[PDB]
Every structure is written in structure tokens, then in C-alpha cells.
Design a protein around this ligand. Sequence first.
Ligand SMILES: Cc1cc2nc3c(=O)[nH]c(=O)nc-3n(C[C@H](O)[C@H](O)[C@H](O)COP(=O)(O)OP(=O)(O)OC[C@H]3O[C@@H](n4cnc5c(N)ncnc54)[C@H](O)[C@@H]3O)c2cc1C
Ligand code: FES
Ligand code: FES
Ligand SMILES: [Ca+2]
Lengths: 49, 98, 1297, 49
Amino acid sequence: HFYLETNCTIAVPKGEAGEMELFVSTQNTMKTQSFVAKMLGVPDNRIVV
Amino acid sequence: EMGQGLHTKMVQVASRALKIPTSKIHISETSTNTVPNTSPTAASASADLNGQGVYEACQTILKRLEPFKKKKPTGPWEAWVMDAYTSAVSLSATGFYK
Amino acid sequence: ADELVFFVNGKKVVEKNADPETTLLVYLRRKLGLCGTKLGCGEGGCGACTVMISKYDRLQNKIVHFSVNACLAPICSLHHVAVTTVEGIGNTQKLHPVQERIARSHGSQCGFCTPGIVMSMYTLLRNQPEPTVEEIENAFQGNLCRCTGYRPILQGFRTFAKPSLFNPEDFKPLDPTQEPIFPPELLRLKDTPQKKLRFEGERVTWIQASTMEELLDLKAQHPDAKLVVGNTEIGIEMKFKNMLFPLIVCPAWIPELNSVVHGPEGISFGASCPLSLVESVLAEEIAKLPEQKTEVFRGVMEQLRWFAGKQVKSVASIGGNIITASPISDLNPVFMASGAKLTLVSRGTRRTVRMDHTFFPGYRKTLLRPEEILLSIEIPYSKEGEFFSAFKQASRREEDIAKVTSGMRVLFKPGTIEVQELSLCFGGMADRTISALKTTPKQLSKSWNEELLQSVCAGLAEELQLAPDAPGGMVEFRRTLTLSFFFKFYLTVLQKLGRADLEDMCGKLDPTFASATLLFQKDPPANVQLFQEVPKDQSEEDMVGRPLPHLAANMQASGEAVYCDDIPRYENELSLRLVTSTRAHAKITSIDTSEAKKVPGFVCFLTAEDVPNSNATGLFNDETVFAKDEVTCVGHIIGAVVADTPEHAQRAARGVKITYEDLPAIITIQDAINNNSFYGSEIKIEKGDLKKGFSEADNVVSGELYIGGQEHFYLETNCTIAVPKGEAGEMELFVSTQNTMKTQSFVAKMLGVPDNRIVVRVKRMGGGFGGKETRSTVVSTALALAAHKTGRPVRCMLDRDEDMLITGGRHPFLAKYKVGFMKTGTVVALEVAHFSNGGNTEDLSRSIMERALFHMDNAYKIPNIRGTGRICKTNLPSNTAFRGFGGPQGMLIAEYWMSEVAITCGLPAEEVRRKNMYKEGDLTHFNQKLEGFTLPRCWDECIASSQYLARKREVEKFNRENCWKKRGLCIIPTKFGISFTLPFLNQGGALVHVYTDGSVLLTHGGTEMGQGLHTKMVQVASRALKIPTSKIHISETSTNTVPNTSPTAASASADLNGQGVYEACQTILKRLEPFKKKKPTGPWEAWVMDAYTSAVSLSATGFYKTPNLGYSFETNSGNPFHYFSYGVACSEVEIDCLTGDHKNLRTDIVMDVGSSLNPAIDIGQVEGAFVQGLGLFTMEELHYSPEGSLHTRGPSTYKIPAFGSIPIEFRVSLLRDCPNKRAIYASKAVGEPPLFLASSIFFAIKDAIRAARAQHGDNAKQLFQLDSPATPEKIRNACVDQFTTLCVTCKSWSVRI
Amino acid sequence: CDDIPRYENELSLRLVTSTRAHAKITSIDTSEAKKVPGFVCFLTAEDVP
Ligand SMILES: Cc1cc2nc3c(=O)[nH]c(=O)nc-3n(C[C@H](O)[C@H](O)[C@H](O)COP(=O)(O)OP(=O)(O)OC[C@H]3O[C@@H](n4cnc5c(N)ncnc54)[C@H](O)[C@@H]3O)c2cc1C
Ligand code: FES
Ligand code: FES
Ligand SMILES: [Ca+2]
């Protein structure tokens, strides 16, 4: 692909109820959210992309 | 947005749908907590899918403003909106397309 | 050396460059990132910063633990100590029992006080694993909570001592072996000897002295070197009076300053001994020694009872109190009256003195030479025939500054009642602790009798006279207290002489006088919470109407809940400090920033010039962002310093020098009346025929009432972070606000960008109470500007002194009433003219006056009625919304004249109120019909369940058998209209998403400030969707998910947002039903995935407007309210007629909250609101200089209810079987309506004072004046007697606003 | 993404990848990594919640 911006994620944990906000260079916010939530074992509603 | 000018096209679409200048419409970002369960931006399809989404949301807002437009057919956009707000009319809407 | 080494939650901290100005609180939060520990005040009064310290004590040879205020502990005092914070004891993955119990017992609302309270309780348990009830209450003298009304905290923690809202049986047991180990390294180091340390900061050098020799050497070589022990005085001087001591010596380690030696004449305390140690050894001594030897000891104990809390007394030294030489020291009068022996030393010198008037030669001065330190105090044994009393009267009992304080000593010639020695010493009566040296000599060789009483009183009234302009004012009260305290001591001595078989010489005490001399004791508390069970058939997953704890209570108990300032700083983030006028009205002639520019890290000073677009803000556009050309109050924001750190911004702000030319100032309501200075025109409601009403009236009573305002005292002050995004003027703000919409609008207008660029986010507030409905924007706009200008994130959290000055409060009210009534008590006519003091800016002032007028009836039908309001425009900080919003003021006036109706008629108040009460179907003075009028049931339930009638008789009996204490009892109703007085604000919105795992993310326009709104909305959505609450999450409130939201205010927010949520949920259900129809059992998660894979939208908005609202002042027609709240409270008090102190003995409340959405949250709101009302009407008083400068700027002077303030017996019932079908799931709003029911305490006090005036007044005026707040001053002054008589006799400390 | 300012307490991650096309992992030694200043942790499959 050679997108001039490579893959990049900032994840910011909010310290309550497994809440986390991610800033991502992605075309797919939904799968990002889903994959993060499943890995951590928290509902999708805790994870913002 | 990845360089393909999608937000630009969606603002152009919204501006036509609402009959207001592009300058009054802003897109800031994409987030899972404003629109959930989104397909990837792919298959070249994103302006088609989201354009419809956007158009429908704009149709809902127009439907809600039309009584205020009827009673003030020349008065500016701003007067219709402020009239709707002080009449406790919702100025937020979702839009969807399949 | 120079490394500082200590432990935090078991982890070693090595600080190589400790700055002596660094507090523990700032180190924990900003250096270690542990933000569980909060800033509430910076003054030691609120306890939000409470943490635990452990050390190996070398003198007692064991591990000790005590609590401290982190806000006042210098890290440089903490070498080889172990700190435990809220994070150190547990977390939501494994809560400590203390955390669990406060959460589950509904003991956490906004949550901001919870860590500090957790740490107080935790520390007590580390010292005493089986405390008493009494020990549990005593642990919180230093902790304030503004939300809970304290009852649930004590009730949950009582389980550690010795249907249902919570189940104590499910609480996990305490295992003390699982507490954190004492860091083993510190145990190894108590072997090696401690050597002197030096720490060098930006401006301050700190020496930790290891030996007496080092301390004396240093003081000889450099007498400028400032002794710091507990820092509980020096911390206040440095933080608030901007005093810099560039060389500090801490002698806390020195054995000689910490020793306790028993000698023949008494007990010697090293001068650095903490007051907690004095307390413990004196309690041992008085327990085990004969009473005749411990009179002075018990006098010191009596003062230490009411002396701050555990946190302060742990580190505050006796020596520090003595040398501080405050006029209001509670200990110096006792040490002076008892001739306590002080040993002073310098390098190679040593002298002993007995404290007497010479020890204190001038304001905050002592006998010490610059190079001398106090080594020790001997507190003496009392002798045979020697008796002692100590006294203190403040505004509040616990952790308060004494008005008058006193030690008193008599010695009798052996075998006689003849005086050999007499010593009466006082604080609060001059610029130092004084002895009544002219009065007491005249008494030597007199017998202890009535004429000695009269002589000492005449002498005191003459010797201790007061200057009208005397610091503090309250000159009559203070003088009355010196006589009244003497009188108690006189009676006490009569009794003690009795106990020594000298009854025949001095006489017996009259038994009706005996209660005068009792030392304060409270009965054990007894609480009742009654509410309705939900139906039997209600699903266990449907939580509507069940007592679900606040969703965030566990996280609040654990310190994991994030408030604004807990958010980590960006690496490039700057700090802002506001710069305010020190003048009430003046021209700004110039600004000089020379000194500001020199402070390291200074970035800029923002002023009106830097505003990009409009300098005009506020709800009615009459406010400046930054002052231009003139200032119009003390606290008017002139500009803002931006710097790297908050400390550099504070210093830089000090170096902004403003020059002023005074202009004529309008301060008071009277001033505004004289000057025709008002916000808009007169507001008026009138019905019937006044002239006719007053003609037909058997009786007509006229009067005035003044009601003081109120500071919100949210435990979290105003705070904004503004994050600029560098594109298209986009900015995101994190704000402690109730009003995201106005925050956003005001920032956008100021910047000159559209609203669509500006996002305002609120996760939660640590209280709001109306104070964050508009006045938060004054910080938000300034930070936004800073952020736009620098392109960097900028943050500002106000200090408590700043917040109290800038952000205004409840509106003071003055009312002039005239009521006409029949001999039966039936009122036929009423005219009331209301005036409010609005301050600097219009803000919500006019709406507040409207609401007061809508409630001038309270519960009563008045056929002929006229009410007017005028809002005064004055050179004071702008006043705003406060829970009640003008209702409490309006209704207190109504009850005030109603009290006088009852007394004029000679009829029971109870019967007079009931007779006048509205009936179902009646119209108000504003022509709204009362339907579903529940007030009579509330009344009849309350009169019956409180046993009001049988208690009346007990009160009457008490009053006949006691001359110097009196009880009062009153039952008060309330009607409170629900909805914003501006109709279109009665709207709310929501947005819901369902993700493909079935989990639901919900948001609405309402903000969480501790009222349990998110909890309720989750309860509501869970019922609407028919899924468990566990699948539903609310993360925050934001302008970019729900736009155009009204403020969280008018108690309306659950009603509005509830409907919005319900409608969003109904849209989702409609879209799912085909999938539900095809698979009527297959779970929720399958319907959701089925809808997704069929491309059905799983996102919806929801919206609601309250229908049919809109009142006209012109036609007196249309409904302002959607429905009304109703309730009744019965309160009993016992006043001390000699001091003006009182106990709240018992309160019973019946409250109509319809079918409660959550009885736990709702009883919480009733108690919290009631207790704020209690403060409003009896304890909370703001004082201003005649030039309009707020003096009262922290908890030291502003006394909100404490744990020990609440009714000793406190019963709350929610009315059963009263569904309100027009609000969400037949609930009613709860936040504001109960507050005015604390009125019941005000009118109980008024009854008790009436009983005092019949006992002791001459031809005492029948309709006597009691303004609000009914403070000890006003209560004492109104109890006219022989003592007030000899004390009665325009430039002064304060002016009535 | 990477233009967003770092939080003061923000950490950096770097992935460790296979140098073999198909192999068993017989061991992982983290000794040397632990000596690098500012090292916080090495995440592996065991750290996944
Ligand atoms: C919330 C709060 C509530 C309070 N309530 C009360 C109250 O009800 N009644 C009351 O009387 N006080 C009250 N105080 C004041 C408190 O008791 C004093 O601040 C305390 O005793 C001072 O002791 P310290 O060790 O903290 O003094 P520091 O602040 O460390 O020192 C204070 C002064 O004493 C000097 N000093 C200390 N030790 C010596 C020594 N050995 N020789 C010579 N000079 C010395 C210091 O140089 C300094 O001038 C309160 C304070 C707070 C913060
Ligand atoms: S912040 Fe420390 S006592 Fe209030
Ligand atoms: S819950 Fe205690 S101050 Fe808010
Ligand atoms: Ca105002």
C-alpha cells in the first residue's frame, strides 16, 4: 500500500468500567472496537474508536 | 477520510439536501459513539452509502423545520432554527441507508 | 544529606530535589499521578485530601498509623514515613470493606468527599479494629460532605461498631492480616541513627533538625529560621496570606520536644507533641486519677473536643498553638487561667515562666526572644478547693474558629467558700488572649454568692468593652457570652462546692438551673427510612423502583472515578489563573505586568484586548469576559495569567498590579432601593381585592424579614480543560458544569467561531447545586481563550477562596409583609414586597424572583393576595441558581408571617396552618389548579408518625422544668412547582446505540453531579428495552451527541431525559420486533445480530418536551408547572439560652416523590436537600466588608453542616400509593423540594426562643424578630435576660447586604 | 494521529516479531530488555485478559 502515514494507534484508558478511547489511523472503526473489546473481555459500549 | 475527499463530498451532499451553504456545515471526525456498526471505508462505496445516510438525516431535519419555513418563507435559516428550538423541536437526527 | 525518601502505597519514592513548598497532595496528584486524593479547600477544613501515614515511632518503639491532611503536609516533613492513599487499600477489582460499605450503603453521591472519608474510617480501623459508634462519628470531625446529609455514611459504618435500602449481611468481613505490610526497609532504617537533612527549593530552604543542639545552634546563628512542626498554621500563612519564610527548620524529630514527663505539680509535654498525644495521655490521667486533681486536664479536654478533626490533631503541636498566639486560640486561655509553666531555651540558656498576660504582649507576639524556642508546657494538677471550667462558642460545634473562648479558675481558702485566687481568661475579645485583671482582684476574700455573681458580671461588662469596628463584629453577642460563660462557671462552682459538703454555706442549686451546667452530650442516633416495595410480579431485572446504588459508587469509594482535574495533563499543557478586582466599583487606570513577566514559566496576561470576537457574555449578555475600563465588584475578573504550572501562575498573578480610581458603589439592597438600581421592572402577582380583605380582617400584622444568601460549597470547585485542535477553530472542553450548551455557545461567541466547532464534555461533577448552571462559564471562557491563543491545552481549577469570591451564591432576600386574618387564624389578605440582591450581572436573578413569587403562598389558600419582587443591581459578585431557585426564600417569608398569625390568635400553629391549607382542586394565586394534591396525606402521616401532639406536651413540660435550656417543636408543609419557569427549557434529548455484541451505549443531555441521574436513566432504559441494567452503559454527556440541551436544573432532569431515553428505546424496540416475532425466545443478542445482518439501523435519537406550559404575568393565566411536589417535616430542637448553641434532636419527613424511580437515591436527595436547608436557615452566613469585599472565603469561616449537625433522630418516609402518571414511570422530581422543609428547624428554634423570652424577658416584645440564618448570635441575642441587659451598649467590620 | 500531543504519563509500545516463517517458540529471554532505561514491560499471550 505504502500509505505515507503508517499504522498508528493511541489508546487512552479512562480508569472506570473498562472504558477506553482510541485514536487510530484506520478505515474500520467497528472491527477496531470489536477486536479491542473481545481481547480485553469488555462490552463494545466501553470502547470508543 | 483517507485522502479520497469523502467528508468534502458529504458536506456538498448535506448542503444541497438542507439548501444552506457548505460554510455552515462541519465534519470533525468519525467515531463509534456517534455512528455505530459501520462498515469499513472500502469497496469504493463509502460516498454512495454515507451520502444516502446523510441525505436522509437532512430530510428529517427539513421535515421538522417545514412549519417554521411555511410561517416565515423568506426569513433566514437562523430564524427557522431558533424558532424550532424555542418551540422545543428536536434539531438532531440519525440517517441510515442499505 | 538531601535525598528525601518515603513510601507511597508500599512503593519507594526517592526525591533528589525536594522543594519545601511541595505539599503531599500536589506530589501525589501531579508527580505520582494518584488522583484519588482530592483538593476541596487547601485549608485543612474539608478532609477531601485525607491520607494515612505509618512510621516506626522510636520513642514508643512500634509501628504507628495516623491520618493527615495531604493539602498541608510538606513532603519535606515525611522522610522515612509510609503513606497510604485510597488507591493503597483496594480498588473496584478488590474493594476494601470500608470502600464496599460506604458505596453499598448509599454513602457516596457526587463522590468527591468519599476517598477522604474512606481514609478517615480506614485509619480508625487500623488503630481500633472494634470502634464504638461514638469513635466512628469522631473520626469525621475533619470531613465534610455536601450531598449525603451524612446519615448513610454513619449507618453503613455502624456495622464496624462493637424493605431495606441495603443489606449489611452481604458485606464481606474484615481480615486485618491482609492490610499492606509496613515497608520492611523502613524497619531496617530505625536502627541507623537519624541525621540532619537540608532541602533546597526555588525559594525556600528546609532543615530537618536531628538534635536539640543543632536546632539551638541554627536559631542562635539565624533567628530568622522559621520553626515548622505540623504546618497547620504556617501552611495557611504561606498559601493564603502569601508569606514566604526562606529558611524553615523542622524540629519534629527531636526527642526532647516529644517527651511526656509526670512530675509533682503536673504533666510536662514537649512542645512538638501533637494534640492527639496530649489528648490520649490526659484521657488516661483523668480516667485513673482523683477528680480533685484533674480539673485543668478536663478543661483542656473540653476545648480539644471541638478543636478541628483527627487529621489536624495528629500533627498540630501544643507548642504551635501556644506560639501562634492567635486571639482565638482555644488553648491559651486555659493555659493562662491555669498558670501553666513554659520552659524556653536558646543555645546555652534556659528560663521558666508561668503563662500570664505578659506572655502575650501584642498581636501574634510572645515573650520569646528571636533566638529562643519553646521546649515544654507543664499542664498542672488542680488542688483541693480549686475548680476549672473551659468554654468555647463558635458558629458550629466541630472544627470551627471560636468567637469567644475562655479558661476559668477559682481557688477557695481551705474549709471556706471564700475566694483565695480567681482567674478569668478570654480569647476572641481582643487582639490577644487577655486576663480580666481589673475584675478578678476585687473578688478576693469574697464568699461565692449572688453578689459575687453581680460584681464579676458588672466588672466583665466594663473591662471587656468592644469597639463597634472590632474585627469580627457581633459585639453584643460576644459580650453577652463573657457574662453567660461566667454564669455557667458560677453555677458549676456552686455545684462542685455542694459535692465537697459545703451546700449549707453556698446553698443548693435550684433544680431548674441544673441543665445550665451540663457538658455537651448527644443521644445515640436513631434513623428510619421507609419506602414502598415494588410489586411482587415485577421482574427481578426491572430495577425501576428498586434501591439500586449509584452506578459509580464503587469507583468513587476507590478513588478511580475521574473528575476534571484528575484527567492527566498533556505534556504541552499550560495553567491559567484568574486576576480579579479588589474594588467594588472603580475605573481601571492602568495595569502593570512587570513583576508578572519575571516569574519563571510566565506565558502571557490575557485582558479584554485579546478577545477575538465579543467581550459580551452571560445569560443576558450584560457581562464582560474580561473587565474593560471599569470593575463592578470585588471578584470582577480583569484578566488571566497563563504559565507552565499552577504555582507559577499564582505567583505571576500576584505580580499583576492594578491601579484604580473609585466610583460610587451600590452594595446593599437599601443602597439599590435609594439609587433606583434594579434589573428590569417590578414583577407582580395579585388576585382578589386587597382593600376589602384588609377591611374584613379582625387583625392585621406588618413586619420585615431578612434572609442571608448561601455558598453552594460543591466539594469540587469550578474546573475547565480546553484542548485546541489546531484546525478550523475546533476545540474540546472538559468542564465541571451543569450547562454544556451555554458553555459551548459562550466559548464560540467569544472566539467568533460557529457552535459546530466547539465540543463540551462532562463526565461528572463533584456537586453543582445550581452554582454550575451558568457561573462555570466564567472560567471556561477564559481557559478557552488561553487555549486558542497558545495553541496548547490549558487548565484551571479554582481554589476554594477564588471560587467562593467569583462565582456568587443564593440570593439574599428582604421582604416587607402585611397579613390580614380572622381570630380563627384564617388569613384573608396578604401583601408582600420582595427584594433580592442580584449583584454584578442579571444571570438568573429575574427567574429566581418569579419562582419566589410563585411560592409566596407555600401551602396556603389566600383569597386576596398581592406579591411584588424587585431585583437589586449591585456592585457584588453576581448571584445565581441554588437548589430551590427562589422557592425557599418565598416560602420562608410565608411561614414567617404564618408563625405570627398563630401567635397573634393564641391558637396552635399546627391548627392554623392546617385550616389555611389548600384543598384538592383549588387554584393558586397564579390560577393553576392543584390536582393529585397529596399534601394533606403527607401532613396527616407526618403528624401521626412523628407523634407531634404527645411531643408538644413533653416540650411544654421540659420548658417548665428548665430555665436556661428550652425546646421547640414545629411541623412545616411545602408545595414546590416542577418545571423551568421558561417553558421551552422543558425539553430533553437522548441518543442510543446498540452494538453487535448486544451492549447498549446511552447518552442524554443531563449531567451527573451526584444526584444519581445516570443511574436512573439506566434503570429507565433497562425497563424500556427489557434487558438487564448490566448491558447498558452511560459514559458521559457531550454537546456532539445531544445538542441544544437545557441545564441540569429545576429538579427536572430525570423527568426530561427519562422521557427522551424511553422514546429512543421505543424506536429501537420497534425496529427489533420482526426479529423478536421470528425468534420469541432466542436471546436479545440474537435479535440484535439478526437486525445488523439485515441492515437495520441500531442507533436512534429520542426527544421530549413538557406539554401545555406557559404562564403569562399579564393575564395571570396558563400553567407554569407540569405538577407539584409535596412534603412535610416535623423538627424538634433544644437551645442553650446562655450560648445560642442548639441540638437538632429529631426530624421526621414525609415526602411525595410519586412512584420513586429509585428510593435509595430519592431518600438520599431528601436528606441531602434537607441538610443544605438546615445550613441555609441555621449555620451558613456570608460576611462582606462595607466596601463589598467577601470576607468569608473558606470552611474556616463558612460553616456548612458537619456529621455532628444532623438531627440525632432522622426519619424519612416516601409517600406510598401516589403514582404521578404524567412523569416518567409515574415518578416525581426530588432534588429541590425537600430543602425548604429544614424550615421546620428554624421555626422550632423560634418556638424555643419564645419560651426563653417568657421565662426571662421583662415586657419582651411578643412578635420578636428572627432573621435567617438563625445562628448562635441571633439565637443568643433574642434570648433577652439579665445578661443581655448589661451588654446592649457607623464604621464597622461588615454590612448587611 | 502521531501529531496529537502526548499526555505527560504516556508510554510507547514496540512490537516484537518472528524472524522465522514457521517454528515453535522454545523460549523467550527478556534479560537484556529489562536493562534498557525506561523499560516498563513485555506483553505476551499470557497478558491477554
Ligand atoms: C482545620 C483547622 C482547624 C483548627 N481549629 C483550631 C481550633 O479550634 N482552635 C485552635 O486553637 N486552633 C485551631 N487551629 C490552629 C491549630 O491548632 C494550630 O494551627 C496548631 O496547633 C499549630 O501547630 P503546628 O505544629 O501545626 O504549628 P506550625 O504551623 O508548624 O507552627 C506555627 C507557629 O508556631 C511556631 N512554633 C512551633 N513550634 C515551636 C516551638 N517549639 N518553639 C517556638 N515556636 C514554635 C512556628 O514558628 C510558627 O510560628 C486549626 C487549624 C486548622 C488547619
Ligand atoms: S483539601 Fe485538605 S482539608 Fe480540604
Ligand atoms: S457525596 Fe460527599 S461532597 Fe458529594
Ligand atoms: Ca445575578
